[PDB]
Amino acid sequence: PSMGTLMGVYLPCLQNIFGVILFLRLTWMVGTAGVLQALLIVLICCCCTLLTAISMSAIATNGVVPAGGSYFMISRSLGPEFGGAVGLCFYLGTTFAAAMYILGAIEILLTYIAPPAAIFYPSGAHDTSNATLNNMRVYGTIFLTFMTLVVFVGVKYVNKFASLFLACVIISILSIYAGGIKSIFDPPVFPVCMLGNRTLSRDQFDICAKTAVVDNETVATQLWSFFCHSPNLTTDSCDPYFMLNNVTEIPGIPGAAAGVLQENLWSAYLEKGDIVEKHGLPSADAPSLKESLPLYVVADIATSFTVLVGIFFPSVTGIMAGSNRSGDLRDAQKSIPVGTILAIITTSLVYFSSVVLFGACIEGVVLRDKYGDGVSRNLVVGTLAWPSPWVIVIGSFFSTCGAGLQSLTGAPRLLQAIAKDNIIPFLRVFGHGKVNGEPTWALLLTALIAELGILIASLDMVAPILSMFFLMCYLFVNLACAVQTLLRTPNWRPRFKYYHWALSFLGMSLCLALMFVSSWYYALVAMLIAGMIYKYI
Amino acid sequence: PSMGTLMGVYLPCLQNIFGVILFLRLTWMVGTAGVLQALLIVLICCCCTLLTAISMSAIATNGVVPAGGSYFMISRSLGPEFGGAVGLCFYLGTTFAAAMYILGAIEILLTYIAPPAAIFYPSGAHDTSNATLNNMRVYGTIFLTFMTLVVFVGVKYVNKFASLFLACVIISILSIYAGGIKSIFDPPVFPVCMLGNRTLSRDQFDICAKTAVVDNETVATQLWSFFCHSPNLTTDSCDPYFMLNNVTEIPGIPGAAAGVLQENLWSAYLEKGDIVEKHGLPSADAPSLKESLPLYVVADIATSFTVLVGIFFPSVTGIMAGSNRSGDLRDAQKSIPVGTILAIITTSLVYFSSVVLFGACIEGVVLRDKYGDGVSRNLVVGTLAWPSPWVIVIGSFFSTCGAGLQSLTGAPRLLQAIAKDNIIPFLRVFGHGKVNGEPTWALLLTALIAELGILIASLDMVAPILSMFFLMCYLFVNLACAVQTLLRTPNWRPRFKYYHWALSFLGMSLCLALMFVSSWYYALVAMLIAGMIYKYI
Numbered sequence A, B: 001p002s003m004g005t006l007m008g009v010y011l012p013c014l015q016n017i018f019g020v021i022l023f024l025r026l027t028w029m030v031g032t033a034g035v036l037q038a039l040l041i042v043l044i045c046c047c048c049t050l051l052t053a054i055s056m057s058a059i060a061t062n063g064v065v066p067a068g069g070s071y072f073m074i075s076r077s078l079g080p081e082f083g084g085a086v087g088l089c090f091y092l093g094t095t096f097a098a099a100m101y102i103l104g105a106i107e108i109l110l111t112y113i114a115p116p117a118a119i120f121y122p123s124g125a126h127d128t129s130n131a132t133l134n135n136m137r138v139y140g141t142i143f144l145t146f147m148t149l150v151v152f153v154g155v156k157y158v159n160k161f162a163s164l165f166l167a168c169v170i171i172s173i174l175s176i177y178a179g180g181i182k183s184i185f186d187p188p189v190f191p192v193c194m195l196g197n198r199t200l201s202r203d204q205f206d207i208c209a210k211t212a213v214v215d216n217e218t219v220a221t222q223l224w225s226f227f228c229h230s231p232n233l234t235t236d237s238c239d240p241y242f243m244l245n246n247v248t249e250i251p252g253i254p255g256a257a258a259g260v261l262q263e264n265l266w267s268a269y270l271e272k273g274d275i276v277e278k279h280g281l282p283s284a285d286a287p288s289l290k291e292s293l294p295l296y297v298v299a300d301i302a303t304s305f306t307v308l309v310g311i312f313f314p315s316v317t318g319i320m321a322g323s324n325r326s327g328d329l330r331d332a333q334k335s336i337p338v339g340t341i342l343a344i345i346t347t348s349l350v351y352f353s354s355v356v357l358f359g360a361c362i363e364g365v366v367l368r369d370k371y372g373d374g375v376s377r378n379l380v381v382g383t384l385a386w387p388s389p390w391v392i393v394i395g396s397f398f399s400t401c402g403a404g405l406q407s408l409t410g411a412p413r414l415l416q417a418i419a420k421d422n423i424i425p426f427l428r429v430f431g432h433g434k435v436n437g438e439p440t441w442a443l444l445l446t447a448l449i450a451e452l453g454i455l456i457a458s459l460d461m462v463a464p465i466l467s468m469f470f471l472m473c474y475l476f477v478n479l480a481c482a483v484q485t486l487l488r489t490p491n492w493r494p495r496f497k498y499y500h501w502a503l504s505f506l507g508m509s510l511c512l513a514l515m516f517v518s519s520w521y522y523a524l525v526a527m528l529i530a531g532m533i534y535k536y537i
């Protein structure tokens, strides 16, 4: 066995922690919560995983570290009762992470790469959401049935091209920082058209002006016709908000400055149906017609602190996939505690610096545009990139398509290993495999469980379920590291310097509080199920 | 043993089938779906239960009919594998039916009896729903903790006053029919104020007129001030829909006629946010301000056929609670098949005649008012009653409060009987009881599971879950009546004239199709769970 700390523990952790939400939902989170509460979300979500890594270091520095996987380490160091729960919650987390990584790639393909490749269209006037959901479901079934046949046939080709999907992530992050440094000197040009406080969708109309001049004559623009329903300049059929207020362009990226970071510093939560608005603009109060409501950037979902925590939390998960090479290492009780902790530190520094960067460079109206309606249907992340916005689009699409394949290769192996362990004979038929050892019936069950997450068809609806499963897994790891100390069991003597039972209790309580924060209802259901299984045994 | 067919089988079935949805969601269903599709919903939902009663008659006409409950009949006539599934699905159905019956009584109390007894108020302008949900949850916890202490202390007093809650239902139905016959000759006076096609909420403004006369002077009314935001008659700040259109009262109950039944005959489905509108009125097309949108009757939820089936279906359930007295009967193989089938026939005739009655008497704009906003916050059912609308309000409130108590007494006995059977030792601690035999730990588990249904806080959100559990129970009964015939098992010779295996197959397929109709997602999850338990055994 010869695998270092770098290519054995650190690089798979750093490949599994970075993902879809850094490129799709982090600018929206900064713009919705403010820089201060966004740093609070990043700090709270990166203390569950740091204390969980301190507990996994106490797992790794005990005994012999049996070869293969993180399931076998926990199962041989903590008994079959805790290990089965950890393995089952981590299997369910990986199978729904595959669904979230597929839905991210479909969102990138349908809203940024190929917009006219849409089957279902928003008929009528309103409900542009049901066509979006039915459009996500069809491409979800197609990409899931393709990427399960790829895993069924081409495991060696997925394992051979596993570092290319990490190179894509690193290039598409260095482009963000290279453009964010350029914006100090030479910011790019993305004009945002507004009307009073309200920002409007630039994709529909042509020119951001109330009147224009053609043939030495003042003619009402296309923007006049959407609000007043006549090409005549002296009608009284206009809404009184459009009449009293003036139409103004602003720079969507004003560059890195202190006055920009000062305005993006506080929370601006909106309910579903509200319009994204500035604060430092004059606006005359007047009622507005209901028929001009599609001519604005509108909050898609209702937001709060507890909504944003549950959407952010699957950015930080990925500790447990740095112990999968625990048989190939030279010194497995040295490479795992150093590697997982340094990977969590570097990824959390990237998240803090990116929160401060997006808060100081991009203006909060562009930040609060989920799907980028204020700027010509572009990525808000992509507008800040240095060479072109297409770098982040292509790199994020290939990174999500790679992270879905790696989850669809990682979860059937885990169900294979749990079934072959005879720990629950109810799953005995899922230990059947090929002559290679590759699973056959576990891959089908992962494709069926990840289909139930695709049929939810939203990134923001699937992500709290992922938070709910990974927080249960990380809670059982901290339970199993505190109980074995407090019960004074034999064969539990961790040789790790920075381990103490109070840190595992603190991690258990923190990953229990985040369970109530992300979604209180299903946490209250899982608490009943867990309190019932305890009354059994 | 001496119990007849009438007081032993027929009256408990007829007490358990009638309930909350006949008085709260049936007029809304008629107005939303039309008379033809409402009769289709009633006909489809009353063929799952009729074929399920034909299968329960084949259960009852086999063997000895062991004493006590419907669980023991199925468990001794079909084996412990089918019987455990039937008993567990029927237990979960009864524990969520208690939650639906509590939420119905809270809806009646907060919207019709005591409106100012509300803790949470709709602050701001919009979101009158979140205050409503948080207002349902608090009174749900209060009424659940009261009606579990009543069941823990006063079982004999709940059993002594069980016929009073049936007398309330029968009086409050005979009042509906007595007023619906009066409306042929002398219809009551409930004026509905409208403005073009759109109907408005009468509870806010005073007089249904655009201008009025005080002191020999024409003065703008209170209804003018809500739409134009000025008491001056010559302003141009009005919305152009209010200016071009005229304000008109109609009779909310025009009486039983053929021209009224002809207009309520077709479907009018609305999406969330649409305004309830007539069809036979002139209306000038004009845009409308967003700030006048609370001055209208608005569809609360989006409706379709599959939404209304899942809300109607728990009106028909209640077959299985006519075999609870199977030890007290004289001829249990005669009283059960006659009693359950005659009770299903009489309740289904009441539903068909009530659909035709509400379609022919009440106008469809009043029918499509869920919560009765068009007529002064009254029950749409209650406006048709003969003596007063308070009869239906008080009778429906006491009937839902009684049907919640009877579910909270029926489900702990079932969990008691399943736990004492040693069929699943995982539930062994729930067979502990008092010295009387009354359960202690099963009553707590019913209070905890019915709390998870109360915290959903909607009648229309809890009702498809009830449909999902009762359709699984009725599917397992038809499976277990077709498999024992087709496998040619011994000790299965039903002596019922009208039984055949094709009727049980037809009932199984119909109660499987309704499972996909009511909610396709959770049916698709339950199909995976059932197909996995089959791959185990």
Ligand SMILES: C[C@@H]1CC[C@@]2(OC1)O[C@H]1C[C@H]3[C@@H]4CC=C5C[C@@H](OCCC(CO[C@@H]6O[C@H](CO)[C@@H](O[C@H]7O[C@H](CO)[C@@H](O)[C@H](O)[C@H]7O)[C@H](O)[C@H]6O)CO[C@@H]6O[C@H](CO)[C@@H](O[C@H]7O[C@H](CO)[C@@H](O)[C@H](O)[C@H]7O)[C@H](O)[C@H]6O)CC[C@]5(C)[C@H]4CC[C@]3(C)[C@H]1[C@@H]2C
Pocket: A088, A092, A272, A301, A302, A303, A307, A449, A452, A453, A455, A456, A457, A458, A460, A461, A464, A465, A519, B519, B520, B521, B525, B528, B529, B532
């Ligand atoms: C050990 C062995 C391994 C395999 C196995 O066990 C044995 O493992 C277990 C694990 C099981 C799974 C455990 C958990 C599960 C999650 C569960 O979802 C619960 C709720 C969510 C799903 O929502 C549903 O989504 C469907 C599809 O949309 C809806 O159906 C609708 O579909 C159509 C639309 O066209 C229409 O008819 C209706 O809309 C409806 O029928 C369901 O209704 C819906 O419940 C998460 O959804 C939640 O939805 C909320 C919306 O109200 C949302 O709130 C917010 O919504 C928006 C944000 O988008 C905002 O406006 C507001 O902020 C909020 O309103 C919530 O965010 C969101 O959480 C499904 C089952 C599943 C997967 C288990 C399956 C079995 C399992 C794998 C077993 C196996 C056997």
Ligand SMILES: C[C@@H]1CC[C@@]2(OC1)O[C@H]1C[C@H]3[C@@H]4CC=C5C[C@@H](OCCC(CO[C@@H]6O[C@H](CO)[C@@H](O[C@H]7O[C@H](CO)[C@@H](O)[C@H](O)[C@H]7O)[C@H](O)[C@H]6O)CO[C@@H]6O[C@H](CO)[C@@H](O[C@H]7O[C@H](CO)[C@@H](O)[C@H](O)[C@H]7O)[C@H](O)[C@H]6O)CC[C@]5(C)[C@H]4CC[C@]3(C)[C@H]1[C@@H]2C
Pocket: A519, A520, A521, A525, A528, A529, A532, B088, B092, B272, B301, B302, B303, B307, B449, B452, B453, B455, B456, B457, B458, B460, B461, B464, B465, B519
């Ligand atoms: C044998 C032994 C006995 C005991 C035991 O096992 C062992 O038995 C089992 C049985 C288990 C139970 C099985 C089933 C269960 C149902 C499951 O619910 C699934 C979905 C529904 C719940 O929705 C959730 O409701 C909560 C509360 O609202 C939401 O949380 C929200 O709360 C706040 C609000 O302030 C806010 O933060 C967010 O809103 C959110 O956090 C959840 O998000 C939500 O998922 C049904 O809800 C569905 O919601 C849809 C809305 O999107 C709705 O679609 C339609 O919505 C409206 C209609 O109102 C319309 O506009 C449209 O037409 C649609 O959008 C759907 O109609 C609706 O179906 C919960 C678990 C439970 C009870 C199991 C518990 C465990 C159990 C008892 C075991 C035990 C151990």
Ligand SMILES: *[C@@H]1O[C@H](CO)[C@@H](O[C@@H]2O[C@H](CO)[C@@H](O)[C@H](O)[C@H]2NC(C)=O)[C@H](O)[C@H]1NC(C)=O
Pocket: A244, A245, A246, A282, A283, A284
């Ligand atoms: C929108 O912008 C215009 C600028 O064109 C403001 O118009 C005022 O115009 C008069 C004469 O045209 C000037 O003397 C004033 O100085 C302008 N006011 C300013 C610059 O504040 C108009 O008031 C603006 N609308 C607003 C602020 O609601």
Ligand SMILES: *[C@@H]1O[C@H](CO)[C@@H](O[C@@H]2O[C@H](CO)[C@@H](O)[C@H](O)[C@H]2NC(C)=O)[C@H](O)[C@H]1NC(C)=O
Pocket: A196, A197, A198, A277, A278, A279, A280, A283, A284, A285, A286
């Ligand atoms: C944007 O402008 C509006 C008025 O042009 C600001 O004023 C609010 O308007 C709403 C109407 O939707 C009222 O309910 C509020 O009471 C108004 N607030 C006041 C007068 O302080 C609105 O605040 C502005 N948006 C910002 C600053 O984010």
Ligand SMILES: *[C@@H]1O[C@H](CO)[C@@H](O[C@@H]2O[C@H](CO)[C@@H](O)[C@H](O)[C@H]2NC(C)=O)[C@H](O)[C@H]1NC(C)=O
Pocket: B244, B245, B246, B282, B283, B284
């Ligand atoms: C609303 O109702 C009024 C009735 O007061 C309609 O007014 C018209 O008024 C003129 C003179 O006042 C009459 O000669 C017409 O016969 C009326 N038209 C009718 C009765 O159709 C007014 O047109 C109505 N608004 C509509 C239908 O949009």
Ligand SMILES: *[C@@H]1O[C@H](CO)[C@@H](O[C@@H]2O[C@H](CO)[C@@H](O)[C@H](O)[C@H]2NC(C)=O)[C@H](O)[C@H]1NC(C)=O
Pocket: B196, B197, B198, B277, B278, B279, B280, B283, B284, B285, B286
């Ligand atoms: C009620 O009146 C309106 C117009 O006063 C009718 O017309 C529809 O108006 C909507 C605007 O919300 C348009 O989108 C439709 O195209 C109009 N339909 C037409 C012109 O046929 C509306 O149909 C009426 N409602 C009814 C009859 O239920």
Ligand SMILES: [Cl-]
Pocket: A017, A018, A019, A020, A021, A022, A314, A315, A316
């Ligand atoms: Cl991610």
Ligand SMILES: [Cl-]
Pocket: A317, A318, A319, A320, A321, A470
């Ligand atoms: Cl992980």
Ligand SMILES: [Cl-]
Pocket: B017, B018, B019, B020, B021, B022, B314, B315, B316
């Ligand atoms: Cl009912």
Ligand SMILES: [Cl-]
Pocket: B317, B318, B319, B320, B321, B470
């Ligand atoms: Cl029933």
Ligand SMILES: [K+]
Pocket: A016, A017, A018, A019, A314, A315, A316, A317, A318
């Ligand atoms: K991740």
Ligand SMILES: [K+]
Pocket: B016, B017, B018, B019, B314, B315, B316, B317, B318
């Ligand atoms: K019922």
